Symmetry: C3
Subunit: 334 residues, 3 copies
């Protein structure tokens, strides 16, 4: 029935985001995406702790999908025979059938094609949700990402002015539940199935062992720090499919923040810390004013420093002594 | 002194809400309600776990009371001699005397009559609050409900347009603390008093054993699923007297949401997930667009699927293939 | 370079706030503050539990600093040789160098002078952040306070009208992690260093032993209750540097609330309970309408009543029977 132009997208791994227009002169299209599920054992910390991950496209989070209001999003979800479990996909951006979950349950060896109309603007979670107790388990195993549905005129500040970002990053935060043995060491398992009983017992106690960005402690640091220049406006999309988070850019602010993540609402301005409700994505933009290192954290600092939830930005440019200066360096007290 | 017309309300058990007008041509009235406290042992899960509940009117949550701005709410609170503890009531909608708590402490065998003027619009928690450590204990035992104070002109979107609901449901969420024995089985107690010491020890550790809607796992499912038709605008009032929640309608949205619950503020639009602060009520309206089953959850999915916090909607009507369609059913990967 | 008038402030201990103007005809100044770090063992509850505290100026929270937009805040941070650890300061109000942390690390026996321009209005956290795992530890040991950056025209309601407070209080909420021995009694330690290993193990489990206002259970009660009169508009600044909170004034409301704490955004009106994201400050104003005792709590009532997080207001004035009245005192049920 639907006679619109088709456009394929090549997804890219987080924290990067596939190329897209903000404001566009294009009308509605069918935008085609493919997600291939991968179950795999991964390392999640600098001590070598392992984890039975379940992923869309091999990454935690799954990749960010970007479309415009009124596009139709046509996703081919593939569950190769090399996996062990059934999986599906639920888009919080979509209307009907449990977000798509009730139309996309696929066994290993199967694929399915779902299309949904992007009638709601904002950033939104997508996640697997097979049914029953499997729902939380697949999500906290890594099976979640986000989609961004932009207005065709791009973003605005609510107050008729345009808000154009120079770059966008997607920070997906993952609460992980890795059981410990009697010694107190993290356990390793041979399969997701074998991890399930211990993992569920821990999950129900509601305290994660690890809280990470991009799948691992330190993932968004060093060579893989986020980057900017003084003068650049950066959009940071943050998602958490299961548990609340409170993002904060140390040394910066949220100049324009949609903490509930939905562009039909004006952004708030000048925030220190914002709040991502578990089961949602939000977004914050900041124009960098100072060079140097920044940390981007959840501002439960225990989670940030001790459980994994810290990213870095490395920012180039000229220091602004008007905004901040060390008037007197450390010295002996007179 | 107060010479206004009196109107009695017949309260109904949640999730239903007693009949009321949205917009009204009535002026201020004294609206009369009766709440009768019931302490009782109840079953809270499908395994037969029991719980020493304390309730207003026999239900968890207590019933929703609905009035209009400027009405006077006159409540007869009754504590029959068949109960064991003193109780009172604190309305977050009311001004003075600890919400009414300091004027309503009644022993078993007593009743009291409190009147308060509804000067603040929104949905608000009411709860028992006897004093000291008894406050949390009575609340987490079930002694909480909500009141809705509507503008006399009904609801609006902040942007001069009316927002009329076709039906309203009240979802009260309850965090419950049921201790376990050494075996690991939930304990049963002969009285609230006997449950207190173990229950308080658990409460202070801040992790519930159960998180339920309408008093029990599965209460708002099956025969007791919530219902709608495509085209119907449904208001969902959600309260949590002690602990945060993050509501989400799986397969839908919050079209208009007052997450802080107060109608003097415009609603936010197009939300995926919203946030009910512990100690508050919020409200979300959605116009259903697709038939089928929806789940209404807190989007800590562990709480939703594993601890009890899932309701269903069953929606009748015609499927909309424009909004969503299964382009290709599950098939072998080529 | 910077040729502006200098003004010294004499800080005062919380919950009080140093004298300041709301609206002002002054232009930008360099406003000079001194903070002297004190490590000390303190008592945190009515049972005599002790705690290895680390503080700015001897208090938990650190004192509230108040300036106006466009002022330059010049802080002399002093770490006397009587302390054992290095410390620094990070202002969420400031731009660059990790909020100032990267320019203020001082060993015992040293001081440093940092200046930052107050370009963002609102209430903001400041805290120590030495590096790595020390960050959460210093914060949850007490090393956090707040700064308020007022518009030069004072506060407004977003809807061109001025919002002038008669008094302001600063409530700093502190999550504390005191380990227990095998008996189940709280442990005492001879130094912060000696407390670290046990304290960090507990911190990572994310459940505080105590949640207090102004450093101790009952600090803002009795002789030290907050006070007001009927007719007075009181601003309550609330901060939490590490963990969420949900403030509520029992028997009152938040008439005007900036829960994210930033004055470039209009306040919300008529709230029951608001939400302070961990890592932030917020503010609420209320005009008292009734005399008597109020409790100001976090509305996780377990935290409020059982873990320490309750303050009182004692309010003088005339009872308003229109707003609330006890129609019939407790009596036997007919
Ligand atoms: O930023 C959204 C916010 O801005 C307002 C204007 O106050 O509307 C702008 O954004 C809408 C959505 O992009 C546009 O359709 C509209 O034309 C534009 O003025 C608000 O209505 C909205 O909540
Ligand atoms: O929805 C509340 C929001 O709408 C505004 C208009 O932007 O006011 C409307 O609602 C008030 C409360 O019902 C009415 O009194 C008012 O007349 C109407 O315009 C806002 O002022 C308010 O925050
Ligand atoms: O309260 C802030 C809120 O109010 C608006 C008007 O709706 O702006 C007022 O506050 C600004 C900051 O103090 C002033 O500069 C402005 O002149 C005044 O109208 C909003 O723009 C703002 O979000
Ligand atoms: O899956 N390993 O690159
Ligand atoms: O601002 N840093 O936690
Ligand atoms: O209280 N039993 O219906
Ligand atoms: O959208 N469901 O968790
Ligand atoms: O530090 N004692 O007052
Ligand atoms: O309103 N008191 O919890
Ligand atoms: Cu899956
Ligand atoms: Cu979901
Ligand atoms: Cu009670
Ligand atoms: Cu309350
Ligand atoms: Cu320090
Ligand atoms: Cu910080």
């Amino acid at each position: 029935d639907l006679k619109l132009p088709r456009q394929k997208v090549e997804l890219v791994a987080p924290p990067f985001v596939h190329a897209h227009e903000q404001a566009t002169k294009q009308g509605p299209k069918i935008v085609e995406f493919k997600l291939t599920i991968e179950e795999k054992k991964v390392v999640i910390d600098e001590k070598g702790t392992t984890f039975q991950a379940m992923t869309f496209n091999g990454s935690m989070p799954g990749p960010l999908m970007v479309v415009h209001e009124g596009d139709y999003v046509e996703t081919t979800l593939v569950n190769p025979a090399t996996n062990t479990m059934p999986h599906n996909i639920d888009f919080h951006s979509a209307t009907g059938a449990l977000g798509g979950g009730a139309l996309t349950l696929i066994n290993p060896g199967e694929q399915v094609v779902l299309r949904w109309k992007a009638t709601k603007t904002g950033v939104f979670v997508y996640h697997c949700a097979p049914g029953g107790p499997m729902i939380p388990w697949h999500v906290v195993s890594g099976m979640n990402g986000a989609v961004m549905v932009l207005p065709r005129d791009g973003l605005n500040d609510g107050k008729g002015h345009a808000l154009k970002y120079d770059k966008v990053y997607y920070v997906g935060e993952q609460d992980m539940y890795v059981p410990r043995d009697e010694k107190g060491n993290f356990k390793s398992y041979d399969s997701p199935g074998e991890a399930f009983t211990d993992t569920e017992e821990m999950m129900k106690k509601l305290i994660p062992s690890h809280v990470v960005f991009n799948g691992k402690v330190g993932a968004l640091t060093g060579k893989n720090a986020l980057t900017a220049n003084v003068g650049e406006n950066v959009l940071i999309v943050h998602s958490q499919a299961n548990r609340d988070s409170r993002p904060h850019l140390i040394g910066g602010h949220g100049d324009y923040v949609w903490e509930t993540g939905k562009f039909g609402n004006a952004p708030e301005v000048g925030l220190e810390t914002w709040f991502i409700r578990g089961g949602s994505a939000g977004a914050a933009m900041y124009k960098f004013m100072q060079p140097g290192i920044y940390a981007y954290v959840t501002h439960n600092l225990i989670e940030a420093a001790d459980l994994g939830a810290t990213a870095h930005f490395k920012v180039e440019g000229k220091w602004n002594d008007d905004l901040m200066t060390q008037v007197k360096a450390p010295a002996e007290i007179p």
